[PDB]
Coordinates of C-alpha atoms in Angstrom, one line a residue:
Chain A
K1 CA -61.9 93.9 128.1
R2 CA -60.8 96.7 125.8
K3 CA -57.0 96.5 125.6
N4 CA -54.2 99.1 125.9
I5 CA -51.5 98.3 123.4
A6 CA -48.2 100.2 123.6
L7 CA -46.8 100.7 120.1
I8 CA -43.2 101.9 119.8
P9 CA -41.9 102.7 116.4
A10 CA -38.1 102.3 116.4
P11 CA -31.1 107.1 116.1
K12 CA -30.4 107.2 119.9
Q13 CA -32.6 104.3 121.0
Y14 CA -29.5 102.2 121.5
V15 CA -27.5 104.6 123.7
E16 CA -26.1 103.0 126.8
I17 CA -27.4 104.7 130.0
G18 CA -27.7 103.2 133.5
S19 CA -27.2 99.5 132.5
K20 CA -29.6 99.1 129.7
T21 CA -30.1 100.9 126.4
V22 CA -32.7 103.7 125.9
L23 CA -35.3 101.3 124.4
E24 CA -34.9 98.8 127.3
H25 CA -35.7 101.6 129.7
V26 CA -38.8 102.5 127.6
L27 CA -40.1 98.9 127.3
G28 CA -39.6 98.5 131.1
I29 CA -42.1 101.3 131.8
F30 CA -44.9 99.7 129.7
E31 CA -44.2 96.1 130.7
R32 CA -44.2 97.0 134.4
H33 CA -47.3 99.1 134.0
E34 CA -50.6 97.5 135.2
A35 CA -52.9 99.3 132.8
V36 CA -50.9 98.3 129.7
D37 CA -51.9 94.9 128.3
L38 CA -49.3 94.4 125.6
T39 CA -46.2 96.2 124.1
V40 CA -45.0 95.9 120.5
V41 CA -41.8 97.4 118.9
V42 CA -41.5 97.8 115.1
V43 CA -37.9 97.7 114.0
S44 CA -36.4 97.7 110.5
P45 CA -36.2 94.4 108.6
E46 CA -32.5 94.0 109.2
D47 CA -32.2 95.6 112.6
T48 CA -29.2 93.9 114.1
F49 CA -29.7 94.7 117.8
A50 CA -33.5 94.3 118.1
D51 CA -32.9 90.6 118.5
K52 CA -31.2 91.0 121.9
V53 CA -34.0 93.2 123.1
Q54 CA -36.4 90.3 122.5
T55 CA -34.5 88.1 125.0
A56 CA -35.0 90.5 127.9
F57 CA -38.6 91.1 127.1
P58 CA -40.3 87.8 125.9
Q59 CA -43.8 89.2 126.4
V60 CA -42.9 92.2 124.1
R61 CA -43.1 91.6 120.4
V62 CA -40.4 92.8 118.1
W63 CA -41.7 92.8 114.5
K64 CA -39.0 93.3 111.9
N65 CA -41.3 95.1 109.5
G66 CA -40.7 98.9 109.7
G67 CA -41.1 101.4 106.9
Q68 CA -38.7 104.1 105.7
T69 CA -40.4 106.8 107.9
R70 CA -41.9 107.0 111.4
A71 CA -45.4 107.6 109.9
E72 CA -45.1 104.5 107.7
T73 CA -43.8 102.1 110.4
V74 CA -46.6 103.3 112.8
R75 CA -49.0 102.5 109.9
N76 CA -47.4 99.0 109.4
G77 CA -47.6 98.3 113.2
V78 CA -51.2 99.2 113.5
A79 CA -52.2 97.3 110.4
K80 CA -50.5 94.1 111.7
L81 CA -52.1 94.5 115.2
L82 CA -55.6 94.7 113.6
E83 CA -54.9 92.2 110.8
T84 CA -53.7 89.6 113.2
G85 CA -56.5 89.8 115.8
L86 CA -54.3 91.2 118.5
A87 CA -56.2 94.5 118.4
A88 CA -59.9 95.0 117.8
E89 CA -60.9 98.2 115.9
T90 CA -62.0 99.6 119.3
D91 CA -58.8 98.7 121.2
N92 CA -56.5 101.6 122.3
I93 CA -53.1 102.0 120.7
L94 CA -50.6 104.1 122.6
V95 CA -47.9 105.1 120.2
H96 CA -44.7 106.2 122.1
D97 CA -41.4 107.6 121.0
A98 CA -38.4 105.2 121.2
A99 CA -36.3 107.9 122.9
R100 CA -38.7 109.2 125.6
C101 CA -37.3 106.9 128.3
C102 CA -38.4 108.9 131.3
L103 CA -42.1 108.6 131.1
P104 CA -43.6 108.9 134.6
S105 CA -45.9 106.1 135.7
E106 CA -48.6 108.4 136.9
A107 CA -48.4 110.3 133.6
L108 CA -49.0 107.1 131.6
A109 CA -51.6 106.2 134.2
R110 CA -53.3 109.5 133.7
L111 CA -53.3 109.2 129.9
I112 CA -55.1 105.8 130.1
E113 CA -57.5 107.2 132.8
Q114 CA -58.7 110.2 130.8
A115 CA -58.0 109.1 127.2
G116 CA -58.7 105.4 127.6
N117 CA -62.5 105.7 127.6
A118 CA -62.8 108.8 125.3
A119 CA -63.5 108.0 121.7
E120 CA -61.6 111.0 120.3
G121 CA -58.3 109.8 121.9
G122 CA -55.8 111.9 123.9
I123 CA -52.2 112.9 123.9
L124 CA -49.8 113.8 126.7
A125 CA -48.8 117.4 126.5
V126 CA -47.5 120.4 128.4
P127 CA -48.5 124.0 127.9
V128 CA -46.0 126.2 126.1
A129 CA -44.4 128.2 128.9
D130 CA -41.8 130.3 127.0
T131 CA -42.2 133.1 124.5
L132 CA -42.1 131.6 120.9
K133 CA -39.9 133.1 118.2
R134 CA -39.8 132.6 114.5
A135 CA -36.1 132.4 113.4
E136 CA -35.1 133.5 109.9
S137 CA -31.4 133.0 109.4
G138 CA -30.0 133.2 113.0
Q139 CA -32.2 136.2 113.8
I140 CA -35.7 136.7 115.1
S141 CA -38.1 137.4 112.3
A142 CA -41.1 137.4 114.5
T143 CA -42.7 136.5 117.8
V144 CA -45.6 134.0 117.6
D145 CA -48.5 134.1 120.1
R146 CA -48.2 131.1 122.5
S147 CA -51.7 131.8 123.7
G148 CA -53.3 128.5 124.5
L149 CA -50.6 126.4 122.8
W150 CA -49.3 123.0 124.0
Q151 CA -46.2 121.0 123.3
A152 CA -47.3 117.4 122.2
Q153 CA -45.5 114.4 123.9
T154 CA -46.0 110.7 123.5
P155 CA -47.6 108.5 124.0
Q156 CA -50.5 109.3 121.7
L157 CA -53.5 107.1 122.6
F158 CA -56.2 106.3 119.9
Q159 CA -58.5 103.5 119.0
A160 CA -56.8 101.1 116.5
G161 CA -59.5 101.4 113.9
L162 CA -59.7 105.2 114.1
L163 CA -55.9 105.3 114.0
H164 CA -55.8 103.0 110.9
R165 CA -58.3 105.2 109.1
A166 CA -56.3 108.3 110.1
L167 CA -52.9 107.3 108.7
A168 CA -54.4 105.8 105.5
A169 CA -54.0 109.1 103.6
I170 CA -48.5 115.2 109.2
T171 CA -46.0 115.1 112.0
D172 CA -47.7 113.2 114.8
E173 CA -50.5 110.7 115.3
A174 CA -52.8 113.3 116.7
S175 CA -52.4 115.5 113.6
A176 CA -53.7 112.6 111.5
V177 CA -56.7 112.2 113.7
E178 CA -57.5 115.9 113.7
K179 CA -57.7 115.8 109.9
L180 CA -60.7 113.4 110.3
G181 CA -62.7 115.9 112.3
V182 CA -61.8 114.3 115.6
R183 CA -60.3 116.5 118.3
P184 CA -58.2 114.3 120.6
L185 CA -57.9 115.5 124.3
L186 CA -54.8 117.2 125.7
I187 CA -53.6 115.4 128.9
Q188 CA -51.1 117.0 131.2
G189 CA -47.8 115.4 130.1
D190 CA -44.6 115.8 132.1
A191 CA -41.5 117.9 132.3
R192 CA -39.3 114.8 132.7
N193 CA -41.0 113.1 129.7
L194 CA -38.5 114.6 127.3
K195 CA -37.2 113.2 124.0
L196 CA -33.5 112.4 123.9
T197 CA -32.5 114.3 120.7
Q198 CA -29.3 116.2 121.6
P199 CA -26.3 115.2 123.7
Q200 CA -27.4 117.9 126.1
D201 CA -30.6 115.9 126.7
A202 CA -28.6 112.7 127.6
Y203 CA -27.2 114.5 130.6
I204 CA -30.7 115.3 132.0
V205 CA -32.0 111.8 131.1
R206 CA -29.1 109.9 132.8
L207 CA -29.6 112.1 135.8
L208 CA -33.3 111.3 135.7
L209 CA -33.0 107.6 135.4
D210 CA -30.2 107.0 137.9
Chain B
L1 CA -13.2 151.9 130.1
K2 CA -14.5 148.8 128.3
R3 CA -18.1 147.9 127.7
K4 CA -19.8 146.2 130.6
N5 CA -22.1 143.2 130.9
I6 CA -24.7 144.0 133.7
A7 CA -27.0 141.1 134.7
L8 CA -30.4 142.4 135.5
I9 CA -32.8 140.1 137.5
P10 CA -36.4 141.3 137.9
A11 CA -37.6 139.7 141.2
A12 CA -40.6 141.7 142.4
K13 CA -41.2 131.4 143.6
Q14 CA -37.6 132.6 143.8
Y15 CA -37.5 131.9 147.5
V16 CA -37.9 128.1 147.3
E17 CA -35.3 126.4 149.5
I18 CA -33.4 123.9 147.4
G19 CA -29.8 122.6 148.1
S20 CA -28.9 125.0 150.9
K21 CA -29.8 128.4 149.4
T22 CA -32.9 129.7 147.8
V23 CA -33.6 129.8 144.0
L24 CA -32.4 133.4 143.7
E25 CA -29.2 132.8 145.6
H26 CA -28.4 130.0 143.1
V27 CA -29.1 132.5 140.2
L28 CA -26.9 135.3 141.6
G29 CA -24.2 132.8 142.2
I30 CA -24.0 132.1 138.5
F31 CA -23.5 135.7 137.5
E32 CA -21.3 136.7 140.4
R33 CA -18.9 133.8 139.7
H34 CA -18.9 134.4 136.0
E35 CA -15.8 136.1 134.5
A36 CA -17.5 138.1 131.7
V37 CA -20.2 139.5 134.0
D38 CA -19.1 142.9 135.4
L39 CA -22.1 143.6 137.7
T40 CA -25.3 142.0 138.9
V41 CA -28.5 143.9 140.0
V42 CA -31.8 142.5 141.4
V43 CA -35.0 144.6 141.5
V44 CA -37.3 143.6 144.3
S45 CA -40.5 145.3 145.4
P46 CA -40.4 148.2 147.7
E47 CA -41.4 146.3 150.8
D48 CA -39.7 143.0 150.0
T49 CA -39.0 141.3 153.3
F50 CA -36.5 138.6 152.2
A51 CA -34.4 140.6 149.8
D52 CA -32.4 142.2 152.6
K53 CA -30.7 138.9 153.6
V54 CA -29.8 138.2 150.0
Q55 CA -27.8 141.4 150.1
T56 CA -25.7 140.1 153.0
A57 CA -24.5 137.1 151.0
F58 CA -23.7 139.1 147.9
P59 CA -22.4 142.5 148.8
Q60 CA -21.1 143.2 145.3
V61 CA -24.7 142.5 144.0
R62 CA -27.2 145.4 144.3
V63 CA -30.7 144.9 145.5
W64 CA -32.8 147.9 144.6
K65 CA -36.2 148.0 146.3
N66 CA -38.0 149.8 143.5
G67 CA -39.9 147.3 141.4
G68 CA -43.1 147.9 139.3
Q69 CA -46.4 146.0 139.4
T70 CA -45.4 143.9 136.4
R71 CA -42.2 142.2 135.1
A72 CA -42.0 144.5 132.1
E73 CA -42.4 147.6 134.4
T74 CA -39.7 146.6 136.9
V75 CA -37.2 145.7 134.1
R76 CA -37.9 149.3 132.8
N77 CA -37.4 150.7 136.3
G78 CA -34.1 148.8 136.7
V79 CA -32.7 149.8 133.2
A80 CA -33.7 153.4 133.9
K81 CA -31.8 153.5 137.2
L82 CA -28.7 151.8 135.6
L83 CA -28.6 154.5 133.0
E84 CA -29.7 157.5 135.1
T85 CA -27.1 156.7 137.8
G86 CA -24.2 156.3 135.5
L87 CA -23.7 152.6 136.2
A88 CA -24.4 151.7 132.6
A89 CA -23.7 153.8 129.5
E90 CA -26.2 153.7 126.6
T91 CA -23.9 151.2 124.8
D92 CA -23.5 148.9 127.8
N93 CA -25.0 145.4 127.7
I94 CA -27.9 144.5 130.0
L95 CA -28.6 140.8 130.5
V96 CA -32.1 140.4 131.8
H97 CA -32.6 137.1 133.5
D98 CA -35.6 135.3 135.0
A99 CA -35.4 135.1 138.8
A100 CA -36.5 131.4 138.5
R101 CA -34.0 130.1 135.9
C102 CA -31.5 128.9 138.5
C103 CA -29.8 126.3 136.2
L104 CA -28.1 128.4 133.6
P105 CA -25.0 126.6 132.3
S106 CA -21.7 128.7 132.5
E107 CA -20.8 128.0 128.8
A108 CA -24.4 129.0 127.9
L109 CA -24.0 132.5 129.5
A110 CA -20.5 132.6 128.1
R111 CA -21.9 131.8 124.6
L112 CA -24.5 134.6 124.9
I113 CA -21.9 137.2 125.7
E114 CA -19.5 135.8 123.0
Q115 CA -22.1 136.0 120.2
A116 CA -24.5 138.7 121.3
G117 CA -22.1 140.8 123.4
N118 CA -20.6 142.6 120.3
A119 CA -23.8 142.5 118.1
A120 CA -25.7 145.7 118.1
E121 CA -29.1 143.9 117.7
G122 CA -28.6 141.9 120.9
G123 CA -29.4 138.3 121.4
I124 CA -31.3 135.8 123.5
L125 CA -30.7 132.2 124.6
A126 CA -33.2 129.9 122.9
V127 CA -33.7 126.3 121.9
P128 CA -35.5 125.1 118.8
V129 CA -39.0 123.7 119.2
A130 CA -38.6 119.9 119.1
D131 CA -42.2 118.9 119.7
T132 CA -45.3 119.2 117.6
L133 CA -47.3 122.2 118.7
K134 CA -51.0 122.0 119.3
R135 CA -53.7 124.8 119.7
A136 CA -55.9 123.8 122.6
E137 CA -59.6 125.0 122.7
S138 CA -61.1 123.7 126.0
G139 CA -59.3 120.5 126.9
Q140 CA -59.1 119.5 123.2
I141 CA -57.0 120.0 120.2
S142 CA -58.5 122.6 117.9
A143 CA -55.5 122.8 115.7
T144 CA -51.8 121.8 115.1
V145 CA -49.5 124.8 114.5
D146 CA -46.5 124.5 112.2
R147 CA -43.3 124.4 114.3
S148 CA -41.1 125.0 111.3
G149 CA -38.4 127.4 112.2
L150 CA -39.7 128.1 115.7
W151 CA -37.6 128.5 118.8
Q152 CA -38.4 128.7 122.5
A153 CA -37.0 131.9 124.1
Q154 CA -35.0 131.6 127.3
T155 CA -33.2 134.2 129.5
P156 CA -31.0 135.9 129.7
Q157 CA -31.9 138.4 127.0
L158 CA -28.9 140.7 126.2
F159 CA -29.3 144.1 124.7
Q160 CA -27.6 147.5 124.9
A161 CA -29.0 149.6 127.8
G162 CA -30.1 152.5 125.6
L163 CA -31.7 150.3 122.9
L164 CA -33.5 148.4 125.7
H165 CA -34.6 151.7 127.3
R166 CA -36.0 153.0 124.0
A167 CA -37.7 149.6 123.4
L168 CA -39.6 149.3 126.7
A169 CA -40.9 152.9 126.6
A170 CA -42.9 152.2 123.4
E171 CA -45.9 150.1 124.4
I172 CA -44.8 142.3 124.3
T173 CA -44.2 139.4 126.6
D174 CA -40.4 139.4 126.7
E175 CA -37.5 141.9 126.3
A176 CA -36.8 140.6 122.8
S177 CA -40.3 141.3 121.5
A178 CA -39.9 145.0 122.6
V179 CA -36.7 145.3 120.5
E180 CA -38.3 143.5 117.6
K181 CA -41.0 146.2 117.5
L182 CA -38.2 148.7 116.9
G183 CA -37.2 147.1 113.6
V184 CA -34.2 145.3 115.3
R185 CA -33.8 141.5 114.9
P186 CA -31.9 140.2 117.9
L187 CA -30.0 136.9 117.2
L188 CA -30.9 133.5 118.5
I189 CA -28.2 131.9 120.5
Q190 CA -28.4 128.2 121.4
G191 CA -29.8 128.1 125.0
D192 CA -29.8 125.0 127.1
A193 CA -32.2 122.2 128.0
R194 CA -31.1 122.5 131.6
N195 CA -31.9 126.3 131.5
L196 CA -35.5 125.7 132.5
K197 CA -37.8 128.0 134.4
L198 CA -39.1 126.7 137.8
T199 CA -42.8 127.3 137.4
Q200 CA -44.5 124.1 138.5
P201 CA -43.8 121.6 141.3
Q202 CA -42.8 119.1 138.6
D203 CA -40.0 121.4 137.6
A204 CA -38.5 121.6 141.1
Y205 CA -37.8 117.9 141.0
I206 CA -35.7 118.3 137.9
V207 CA -34.1 121.5 139.2
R208 CA -33.1 120.1 142.6
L209 CA -31.7 117.1 140.7
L210 CA -29.8 119.5 138.5
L211 CA -28.2 121.3 141.5
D212 CA -26.3 118.2 142.6

């Protein structure tokens, strides 16, 4: 009865890869996933291409009311899901990155299975493998202890009400929730669930999709 | 007599069969086909059973059966025998590389040697931390750590043999940290996303997929 709403705040989401753009590959994962009950994508007011995404995914909702920053648009999205009746305060919101278009099904599964029924919420993440270094101006100014450190991935699953309190007044959704006194879980993410930031990342993604 | 570039691979699972050759064979292949790399050594443990057949595919490469009990130790042993045997002069570059990073781009290694090769301090291949970092506590997030100006170290780690030799004798997870404790600040050279270390089963998928 409690729903699982995918929320995707949405510049490489339009890249052509395979046959569809990055976003199309992202929506596909959520809309084809059993556990996910609904998927919403917040785009900017005058987002010229979003319109065409809507015609491939009618069940998905493309609201043209984004903010100037990721943080803001997630806020807007959650406040229109709550304020419309689509999401009850206790419904789960899975915020996902527009560019992580290689999210395994069993990873998403896993998030919902361990974070879905945990008040605190949960985030997909992988343990820091590599030694960490603090750069200064091209040079190593120090080594930071990676002891018990994890790299956060999306999606980040939290109750809509909790999430709405959280963002109401600082990099991810989880950081907002940790500021309340709530410790979200850390769920094994995935190596292939990488964000397409650099051109170098496109290669591995294209290779992953196809 | 020009300054060399000696790849050093501490290898005391690098034996995973992927493609047609094992992980190690794919690593050695990168260094042995690379122009700028003058020599490639691999330190395996005393009684390593499968190192011998690696030698037969790479005669120029040298497999010394004298590893330590720990990565740090064996790198130390290898650098000490490269110096103590005359193969490497104090000013010669030693590129330590992870036995399991079998997807090192050629231009990446090229780049390391081009920017760290003639820089006393040394250098390491690394990529900036993209993702928010979180401090776990026992399955939960106990704190978010600022990723501002942080990089993820990769291999190889290129340093003069002598410097390296001083560094390791001191007494701390990678080579760079050892040189950093000398007052030396090794550079940060753009590494590669594909230059990933095969540690979990989930990585093999991506690696196999990369060696195609």
